[PDB]
Design a binder for these strands. Structure first.
Lengths: 251, 96, 107, 558, 94, 218, 390, 39, 107
RNA sequence: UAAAUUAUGGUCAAUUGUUAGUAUUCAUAUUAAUUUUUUUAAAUGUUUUAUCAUUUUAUAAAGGUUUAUUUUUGAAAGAUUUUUUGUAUAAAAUUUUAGGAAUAGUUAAUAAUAAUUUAUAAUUUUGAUUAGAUUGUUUUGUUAAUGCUAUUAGAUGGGUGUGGAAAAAUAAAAAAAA
């Protein structure tokens, strides 16, 4: 009788991607907030493991009709800065948006430029980032990034295709997220290193006469505190830790 | 007993219960009518059915026909003939 | 196919359906019409919506607005009661005049 | 607490419910996983006292409990009572038996002439045992019985069971595997609300959302099907692996001090019965190879190889390098067998872990022996050779990209570095496992010994404090052993390790408890605080009530 | 009702008012209340260093501590080797 | 209905059942049919989410959910980095393909257990000792068994068209567990569930207090 | 246990399945082993013994048969336990080895009871006396031997019990070696039974064990067997077996009374077998379980006269020495008295002659179930009747 | 002694309502019916 | 599960597919997996023999049953409705020959 | 038509206060009274917070009329975590009136959330609908009494759509985050 078919406890909800306050606009720094760490981890993975389809030819040439269906969510690296076809280029100059590549620019690779390429039909988007110089990370001989001339004429560019105005789930790179170890501290001990018998193992702790130097005398604060952080449910310093384990805060 | 089948996928079953009057030490049998549910239209008027309560199916339908204990052979044969399961009565309720 | 399943709780009808049998009374013309004109109206409505979408959009907007901007859309217990006029009798007459009677069925 | 599983099984009885074989299996499985083998046997005894004949899956669960507990008498009673009459599937036999019992129903005549107690249905598992046994698990039953007899020491019975099992699996077909039934849980069809916080929700650490495993596994797992989906020869490989596993657990049970790492100097040297144990295991492996022959080349043996490496590394104490050599020789033997040249497969993480553990055992030591602040190492220990071999192995594993590097592998690498005495274990930990893995505090239990050898006492202390801050920032609590290790050096480094609340409650509780024990009067029993009497819902005897009859002044009869 | 009190206090983790807490402390079922404070002894003063010194001076060992905790919270019917042998089945094995 | 006639009707039913058991004498071995499901659960209505389509306790596994399948092994050409560089090696994946599946279906299944982000990334074709297999040919027509060395040659294309629209755990029962991190053949499926809380009975039925006279049962 | 293709077995099929050759084995010892195996069971072991995929009528009949077997085995279990308890009691009271207690006599019992009563233990002496008197009636090492062996043969016939007597983990009593014992005492004992007792099926059906067909066919086979050993040129057919043309030794199985008798008809003559020996004629009828049909089953005097007259016409025997005897038998089994009387009047052979001719009749011990007095009275009257002579 | 079910009911009422079992309500109140309409 | 019901349009839609699978199977028959498919088609035929059915639908049903070599439990009702169709005006020799071929292939 | 058999050879009893439970006064009880007392005059301080805000704090009365209900998991309890997944919405059954009849935002079916559809629909003389009276209520009282009689637990579709839940304009107090 269309009223006694089911319960009403869990009704249909409006899709999460049709609410403006849930969709990330690509013209704001919040877009670059969501993607930068994925680029950092992808470059770290590419530096230490051969990932299959990350280094490629000029550009993935899919038909103009399948472009927006097959292309979005796809990522690839290329040697030298060359931009795809049929795109309008917008170079982001906003410091509030460029601040989010600081850990990418310093600890992985110096970033030359960041640009947003909007399709002529305004339905697909390409975040493309040009890096310069060699990697600040050690690159393995087998790592797929070691097959790039620009890394290790010295600039190479990453491209990441995504749909505009979608929730932050679009801006997710999960499959490029497997932690492969980088063997830096073991090569010296390995047989491949002639700096192999030069290290003297420490099997025993040295006999210690001195005790650890005492810390400077503890000075109680002199300002008005907000209360007990453990009581107010503030994690240590509001930064990290556990409410139960209070530390590094006042007292 | 199935009493009416004018509604689709629904059987009206007349059921009886007992009320007790201590003063007169009496056991008088009352009657109650229930909308049952038979999805395949297998109940004919005059069937002795076993009915069981369940979830609600309609505004007034919270029972179903668990089993037909004694079908109306005459009713089925009349329906084969193309008549009504039981000839309609000639008396009824007054209009005023 | 005349006895339901005591342990699974299946009715006579489900037992027969699982056995592959058919215990259906001979239907009259009006009953067969009831079982036949379910598809015709669906096809008519779907064809209407496919053929002239301006009027279909208008009618759908009317329905949606009339529902959304409607009172008693909470899906609380009062709205969820099956028989409002009989479950809530004291409301009728002196508070609610939608129903002029408190009994519409065997209950 | 684990007792609660047994309590909830008993509430089913007290509520006049008939627990099903699935309830019994679940209770036994949970209690065994919690380690309460006596409670598991109590569950079995409850089943028997209820007089429900066990499905073969219930038999298998009880036999697993018996295998782990090393009790052969339990399994022998179970065998004589139930497991006998079990047979392997024959070539002409029907693969799954047709369902026999028809669901309970009553006709119009039975509903009238039968009594209520006969018309009543209560889901009795005895009615359904035979339709539960539609699939042959006698293969599993025989494997479990062989394990039980081997653990109990009855080698003749072990040989009986194993020979019967192997000849059956060489000369008889595979039975159809029982598909998993998804009606045992009440999960929702889909997630009602899509929240999916980002992996990088925290600006401090990297979290693991419900969508993606975004931190790297904390434990290595084997990539294999379930025991029921194996072929006959595949399950024969599995049987050899499992009897080796039982040999291993019995060796560990017999010599608990030679199998726990860095506890006593006996850990370094193989015991007296190790040679006979290894001879038995190796002759069994050769028996497997001879029996299967060329067919073995098309059977996955990663788990068997991992078991072989573990049994040789624990019972046999062979070096990690020799362990890798044995693994490579086994893989090359398998590849060569089959006349299919120019194609050999690689080791997996499941056995790369075993070789790394062999290296870690090589480099292990006895910490703070005889209060001398000196760690006693194995005789003839060569840190440079061990480090060279480990570095080569790690480079090979990294060069192979199809190995997933769970956290335990990095743990063995770090432990080997610390034991070998190189001062780069902390650097490797920071670069490879700090931010990219969900690491426990055993890593820090090793890195603390690494730190203790620092030239500067202040460097030692600061490294300890930074390790604690890491425990805080990345959600890895500091374990009791790590905290005690750091406490034992409170005089030299004054690194506090106990909370200002924990120490106060310790003070008060401990002083009160010592005072209470030393007092004599309060040692007397207290019935009000000692126990609960009759936690059941109803009285244990009839107080006379109720009175099911009215009264003269009462008209409301029913 | 001591059995029901233990049920609701332990498994249901219900709350306890101070007046009932004081009344029950008289029965040996609970410790004296938090507000049953003697006017004479002032409240304690805690020092981390002294507390640490005491804890190190007499700290329990890992296994004894864990076994006391297990006996108190998780289980109390742990059978001896003698009881396991008694329960173990005998020669005929049927 | 008059209850006094219940005894007479019981006698009549007994005699009728005896006449039935005595006259027709046509029982026999009949295949039992799967009991299907019933829409008439008791209590109040259930929501869409929990409509798993079974409303009674059935402790058996009927035929429709049982499938006949063979444990095939599929070989892969993988390259490992040894000190020299890029040594060729072999990788295998365990697949449980139904006996009646086609080679295209087996390939599509292999696409689904390739959790490895490195193994099944480019279009490949199945072959036996080099001889490529017809993708619309049944396993029985090729005679392939578990002891059949079968290789996957990866043509160096890209953008392998995938459709995760079919859940890894799809049986005729149409269950959809959201987590697809492991195949049903690999999942143990019997383990303690920590995502829940055990709940005790906090609602006394009839007995609330000092004296258990009768317990106000019902 | 029950199997999808398991089925019940007939006598020929049982003999074919257990067709083994043996020369020497102690029936009593192997039977004791098999009975201890049975007694060392739980009630569960009797559970899944009905083969599935079998029609409901045969399924229910097998259920009655197996329940009867289980009840008889339990009764013998209780009797055996009580007998052993009395053995231990006598051995403890007297001090004699319990092994030699089974060969003592009333003189020894008297002397021991006198010693006990002299030592001042009157209650203990009474216990000893009661135990010995109760045990001299139940202590024979082969007490219900035929019943026990027929029960084992019924287990063999069921076809689902072959596998419950092996695959047991035992331990060597002396060396304490745990092993799996695969010897099948049930197989050996059933092979010996089939080899030796060529008409164990007849004994099993006579005892009332067969619920499917009863004992009528086995009775016909037994009667034909005795006819073949009593005549010297015997020709048999479907329903008629004849000896010589001068001795008038004819057996004729007329019909089946149980199925022939309809409950709503009025006819007085329905007989199972008709046997004429020389000048005498006998009508053997198995009394139907229905008391309201036994009366229509027993033929009338004038119908008996007509049968005699037709016999005289056909076989030319003078009407002078033609005499008919009507014979009634129990519905579902035979009594020992019934069998001896059947031999006495139908075949005119005495008790010693009967036991010489068939060995097992000597100790075939069966009694009329006291629960049915109607049959006892009717059979008493019919067997006490005189030869109707015309 | 043995108590009625009324004792159990009174116990339940006392426990739930805290001693409130009854009020000893006046029983002999003299009611009257006042007719408003015509005969 | 009873959440659906098939009419002759659905049954005629399905039957050709099952016949095609039959012809593509190594033997002539389908796996045991399709027992419930055929049982549902059987119950649908049995039920819809009571409603009002067109000549084309009946003919297609007969041809599908012939193709799938499936004899329904409502064979009697099907042949009765075929009798109630043979002598109609809409019936032509093409329809009659198809009906006779299907009935021969079945019976 | 059974016909009066000769052992009469065993008498000597009962009572010892010891209980298998509705018991009847047509006038004594039972009520307003012979014995009715005692007070009561409104105008009002919950709290913590980051401060013109935010967090915690869900059944007062009169009136109107009352089916015969309710475990929002959603807040708290509460813990080594984690869900606003921890099945709360249902049914059976018992009512009154000196002048006794019609009722309807209507019944079922439905690919129909939000019904352009289909049907010979549904309630009622086994007493409906409306109107009148009207919380229920083995608890009160009375009696030899399955009779008569009496009653106060509650609940509340337009006042914020907030909240886990409207129960929200008053709070003998159930102590409300040191």
């Amino acid at each position: 009788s269309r009223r006694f078919r089911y319960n009403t406890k869990f009704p249909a909800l409006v899709s999460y991607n049709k609410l403006p306050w849930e969709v990330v606009n690509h013209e704001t720094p919040q877009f670059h907030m969501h993607v930068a760490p994925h680029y950092e981890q992808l470059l770290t993975l590419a530096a230490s493991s051969p990932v299959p389809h990350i280094i490629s030819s000029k550009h993935i040439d899919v038909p103009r009709e399948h472009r927006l269906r097959l292309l979005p969510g796809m990522l690839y690296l290329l040697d030298g800065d060359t931009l795809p076809e049929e795109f309008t280029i917008n170079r982001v100059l906003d410091p509030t948006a460029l601040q989010y590549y600081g850990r990418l620019s310093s600890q992985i690779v110096t970033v030359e430029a960041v640009r947003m390429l909007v399709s002529d039909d305004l339905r697909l988007l390409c975040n493309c980032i040009t890096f310069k110089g060699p990697l600040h990370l050690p690159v393995a001989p087998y790592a797929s990034l070691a097959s790039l001339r620009g890394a290790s004429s010295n600039c190479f560019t990453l491209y990441h295709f995504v749909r505009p105005n979608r929730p932050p789930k679009e801006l997710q790179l999960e499959k490029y997220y497997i932690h492969a170890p980088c063997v830096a501290p073991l090569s010296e001990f390995a047989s491949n290193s002639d700096e192999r018998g030069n290290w003297r193992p420490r099997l025993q702790a040295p006999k210690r006469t001195q005790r650890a130097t005492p810390l400077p005398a503890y000075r109680p604060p002199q300002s008005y505190l907000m209360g007990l952080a453990e009581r107010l449910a503030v994690v240590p310093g509001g930064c990290f830790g556990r409410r139960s384990l209070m530390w590094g805060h006042w007292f | 007993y199935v009493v009416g089948t004018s509604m689709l996928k629904t059987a009206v079953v007349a059921t009886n219960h007992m009320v007790y009057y201590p003063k007169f030490n009496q056991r008088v049998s009352r009657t109650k009518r229930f909308f049952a549910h038979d999805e395949d239209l297998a109940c004919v008027e005059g069937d002795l059915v076993h009915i069981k309560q369940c979830r609600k199916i309609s505004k007034y339908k919270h029972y179903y026909v668990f089993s037909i204990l004694e079908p109306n052979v005459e009713g089925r044969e009349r329906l084969k003939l193309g008549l009504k399961a039981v000839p309609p009565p000639l008396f009824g309720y007054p209009v005023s | 196919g005349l006895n339901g399943c005591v342990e699974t709780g299946r009715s006579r009808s489900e037992v027969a359906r699982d056995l592959g049998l058919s215990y259906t009374r001979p239907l009259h013309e009006n009953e067969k019409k009831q079982l036949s004109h379910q598809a015709v109206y669906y096809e008519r409505l779907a064809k209407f919506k496919m053929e002239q979408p301006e009027a279909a959009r208008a009618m759908e907007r009317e329905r949606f607005v009339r529902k959304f901007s409607g009172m008693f859309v909470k899906m609380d217990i009062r709205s969820g009661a099956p028989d409002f006029p009989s479950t809530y009798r004291r409301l009728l007459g002196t508070k609610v005049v939608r129903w002029a009677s408190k009994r519409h069925g065997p209950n | 607490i684990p007792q609660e599983a047994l309590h909830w099984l008993l509430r089913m009885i007290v509520d006049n419910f008939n627990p099903q074989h699935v309830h019994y299996i679940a209770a036994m499985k949970t209690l065994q996983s919690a380690g309460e083998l006596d409670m598991a046997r109590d569950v079995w005894k409850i089943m028997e006292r209820q007089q429900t004949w066990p499905c073969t899956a219930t038999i298998c669960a009880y036999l697993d409990v018996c295998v782990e507990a090393g009790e052969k008498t339990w399994a022998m009673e179970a065998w004589n009572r139930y497991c006998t009459e079990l047979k392997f599937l024959e070539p002409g036999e029907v693969d799954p038996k047709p369902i026999s019992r028809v669901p309970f129903s009553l006709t119009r005549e039975e509903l009238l002439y039968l009594p209520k107690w006969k018309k009543h249905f209560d889901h009795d598992p005895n009615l359904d045992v035979m339709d539960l046994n539609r699939f042959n698990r006698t293969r599993e039953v025989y494997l479990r019985m062989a394990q039980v007899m081997l653990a109990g020491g009855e080698r003749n019975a072990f040989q009986h069971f194993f020979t019967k099992l192997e000849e059956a699996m060489l000369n008889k077909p595979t039975p159809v595997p029982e598909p998993p039934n998804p009606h045992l849980v009440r999960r929702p069809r889909w997630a009602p609300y899509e929240h999916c916080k980002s992996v990088h929700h925290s600006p401090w650490r990297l979290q693991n959302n419900g969508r993606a495993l975004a931190l790297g596994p904390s434990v290595t797992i084997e990539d294999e099907m379930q025991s029921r989906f194996f072929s006959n020869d595949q399950f024969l490989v599995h049987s050899v692996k499992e009897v080796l596993r039982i040999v291993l657990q019995e060796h560990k049970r017999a010599h608990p001090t030679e199998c726990t790492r860095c506890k006593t100097e006996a850990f370094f040297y193989k015991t007296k019965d190790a040679d006979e144990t290894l001879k038995f295991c190796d002759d069994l492996i050769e028996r497997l190879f001879a029996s299967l022959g060329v067919r073995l080349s098309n059977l996955n043996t990663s788990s068997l190889l991992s078991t072989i490496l573990e049994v040789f590394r624990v019972v046999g104490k062979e070096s990690g390098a020799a362990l890798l050599q044995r693994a490579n020789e086994f893989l090359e033997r398998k590849a060569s067998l089959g006349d299919a040249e120019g194609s050999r497969e690689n080791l997996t993480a499941s056995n790369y872990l075993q070789v790394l553990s062999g290296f870690a055992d090589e480099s292990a030591f006895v910490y703070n022996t005889k209060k001398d602040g000196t760690c006693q190492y194995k005789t003839g220990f060569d840190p440079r050779t061990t480090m060279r071999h480990l570095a080569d192995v790690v480079q090979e594993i990294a060069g192979n990209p199809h190995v997933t590097w769970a956290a335990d592998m990095h743990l063995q690498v770090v432990e080997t570095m610390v034991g070998c005495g190189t001062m780069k274990a902390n650097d490797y930990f920071v670069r490879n496992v700090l931010r990219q893995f969900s690491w426990d505090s055993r890593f820090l239990e090793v890195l603390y010994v690494e730190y203790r050898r620092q030239d500067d006492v202040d460097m030692w202390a600061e490294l300890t404090k930074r390790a604690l801050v890491w425990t805080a920032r990345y959600n890895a609590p500091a374990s009791e052993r790590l905290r005690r290790l750091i406490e034992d050096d409170y005089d030299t480094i004054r690194v506090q390790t106990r909370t200002f609340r924990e120490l106060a409650v310790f003070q008060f509780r401990d002083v009160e408890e010592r005072r209470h024990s030393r007092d004599v009067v309060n040692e007397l029993p207290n019935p009000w605080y000692d126990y609960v009497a009759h936690a059941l819902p109803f009285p244990d005897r009839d107080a006379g009530y109720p009175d099911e009859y009215g009264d003269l002044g009462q008209w409301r009869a029913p | 009702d001591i059995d029901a009190f233990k049920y609701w206090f332990g498994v249901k983790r219900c709350r306890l008012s101070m007046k009932p807490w004081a009344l029950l402390a008289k029965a040996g079922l609970l410790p004296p209340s938090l507000t049953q404070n003697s006017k004479i002894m002032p409240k304690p003063l805690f020092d981390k260093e002294s507390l640490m010194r005491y804890y190190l001076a007499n700290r329990k060992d890992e296994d004894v501590m864990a076994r006391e905790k297990y006996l108190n919270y998780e289980n109390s019917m742990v059978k001896t080797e003698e009881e396991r042998a008694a329960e173990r089945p005998v020669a005929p094995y049927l | 209905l008059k209850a006094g006639l219940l005894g007479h009707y019981q006698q009549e039913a007994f005699e009728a059942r005896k006449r039935f058991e005595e006259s027709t004498t046509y029982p026999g071995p009949i295949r039992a049919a799967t009991p299907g499901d019933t829409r008439f659960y008791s209590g109040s209505l259930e929501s869409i989410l929990h409509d798993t389509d079974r409303h009674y306790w059935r402790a058996v596994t009927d035929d429709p959910r049982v499938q006949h399948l063979i444990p095939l092994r599929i070989r892969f050409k993988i390259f490992t980095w040894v000190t020299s560089g890029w040594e060729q090696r072999m990788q295998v994946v365990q697949i449980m393909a139904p006996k009646d599946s086609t080679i295209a279906q087996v390939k599509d299944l292999v696409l689904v257990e390739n959790q490895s982000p490195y193994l099944c990334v480019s279009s490949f074709h199945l072959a036996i000792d080099g001889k490529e297999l017809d993708p619309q040919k049944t396993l029985g027509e090729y005679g392939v068994t578990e002891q059949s060395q079968i290789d996957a040659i990866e043509q160096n294309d890209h953008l392998l068209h995938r459709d995760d629209e079919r859940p890894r755990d799809w049986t005729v029962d149409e269950i959809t567990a959201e987590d697809v991190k492991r195949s049903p053949y690999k999942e143990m499926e019997m383990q303690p569930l920590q995502n829940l809380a055990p709940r005790y009975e906090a609602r006394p039925k009839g007995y609330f207090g000092r004296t258990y006279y009768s317990g106000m049962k019902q | 246990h029950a199997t999808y293709g398991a089925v019940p077995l007939t006598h020929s099929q049982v003999t074919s399945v257990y067709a083994t050759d043996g020369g020497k084995v102690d029936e009593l010892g192997l039977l004791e082993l098999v009975e201890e195996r049975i007694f060392s069971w739980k009630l569960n072991k009797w559970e899944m013994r009905i083969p599935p995929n079998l029609p409901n009528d045969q399924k229910e009949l097998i259920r009655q048969e197996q329940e009867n077997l289980k009840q008889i085995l339990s009764g013998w279990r209780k009797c055996f336990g009580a007998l052993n308890a009395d053995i231990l009691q006598i051995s403890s009271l007297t001090g004699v080895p319990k092994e030699v207690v089974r060969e003592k006599n009333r003189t020894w019992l008297q002397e021991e009871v006198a010693k006990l009563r002299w030592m001042g233990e009157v209650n203990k002496a009474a216990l000893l006396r009661d135990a010995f008197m109760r045990l001299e009636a139940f202590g024979s090492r082969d007490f219900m031997f035929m019943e026990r062996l027929c029960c084992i043969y019924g287990l063999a016939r069921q076809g689902t019990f072959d596998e419950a007597f092996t695959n047991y983990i035992t331990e060597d009593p002396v060396t304490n070696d745990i092993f799996v014992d695969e010897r099948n005492p049930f197989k050996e004992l059933v092979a010996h039974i089939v080899r030796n007792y060529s008409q164990i099926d007849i004994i099993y059906d006579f005892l009332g064990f067969n619920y499917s067909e009863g004992y009528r066919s086995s009775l016909r086979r037994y009667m034909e067997y005795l006819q073949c050993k009593t005549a010297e040129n015997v020709r048999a057919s479907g329903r008629l077996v004849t000896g010589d043309k001068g001795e008038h030794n004819i057996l004729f199985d007329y019909c089946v009374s149980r199925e022939s008798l309809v409950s709503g008809d009025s006819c007085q003559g329905i007989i199972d077998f008709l046997y004429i020996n020389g000048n005498d004629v006998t009508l053997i009828i198995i009394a139907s379980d229905n008391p309201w049909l036994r009366n229509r089953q027993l033929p009338h005097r004038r119908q008996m006269e007509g049968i005699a007259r037709r016999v005289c016409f056909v076989l030319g025997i003078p009407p002078s020495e033609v005499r008919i005897r009507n014979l009634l038998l129990p519905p579902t089994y035979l009594d020992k008295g019934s069998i001896v009387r059947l031999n006495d009047i139908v075949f005119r052979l005495s008790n010693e002659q009967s036991n010489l001719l068939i060995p097992w009749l000597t100790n075939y011990n069966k009694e009329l179930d006291p629960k049915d007095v109607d049959y006892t009275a009717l059979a008493k009257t019919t067997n006490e009747e005189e030869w109707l002579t015309l | 002694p043995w108590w009625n079910f009324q004792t159990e009911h009174r116990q339940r009422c006392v426990l739930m309502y805290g001693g409130a079992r009854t009020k000893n309500t006046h029983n002999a109140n003299h009611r009257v019916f006042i007719k408003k309409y015509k005969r | 599960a009873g959440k659906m019901s098939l009419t002759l349009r659905e049954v005629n839609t399905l039957l050709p597919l099952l016949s095609r699978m039959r012809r593509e199977s190594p033997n002539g028959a389908l796996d045991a997996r399709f027992d419930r498919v055929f049982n549902a088609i059987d119950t649908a035929i049995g039920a819809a023999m009571r409603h009002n059915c067109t000549l084309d639908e009946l003919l297609d049903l007969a041809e599908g049953l012939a193709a799938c070599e499936m004899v329904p439990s409502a064979l009697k009702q099907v042949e009765m409705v075929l009798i109630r169709s043979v002598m109609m005006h809409e019936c032509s020799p093409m329809h009659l020959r198809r009906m006779l071929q299907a009935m021969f292939t079945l019976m």
